[PDB]
Amino acid sequence: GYSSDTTPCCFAYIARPMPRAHIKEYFYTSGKCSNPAVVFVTRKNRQVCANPEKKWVREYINSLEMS
Amino acid sequence: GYSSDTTPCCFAYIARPMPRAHIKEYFYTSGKCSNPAVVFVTRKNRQVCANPEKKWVREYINSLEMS
């Protein structure tokens, strides 16, 4: 018995790294989704799916976590 | 291939019918999602997953479709 609310999932990963300065937040999609995904939130508040195994993705997360 | 945007998916259905007056509109979730679903959008913009096979759910869509 879980939420009956929708939850965002990803079905494709952005191919090339987004400019780091345009990203302000990230989150991981629900473990219920078929794919693991990182979602980068841009400064124009768009949400972009990214491959959590990619090097640049892991670096961006580390950078967003540091401050 | 798909876009790298997120997509709302459903993982549980609301058991009992919600009040018809609270519903603004509906949409079906993407066939990319593993569970088929209708999403009912309330006046406060809540997105509630529902089972399209269920009688009350198809009555509500018909009501939001014919007018």
Curated annotation (Swiss-Prot), chains A, B:
Changing residue 7 to A: No effect on inhibition of activity by tick evasin-4. The modification Methionine sulfoxide is found at residue 66. The record marks 1-2 as: Cleavage. Coiled coil: none annotated. Changing residue 31 to A/K: No effect on inhibition of activity by tick evasin-4. Transmembrane segments: none annotated. Disulfide bonds join 9-33, 10-49. This is C-C motif chemokine 5. The chain holds residues 25 to 91 of 91 of the full protein.
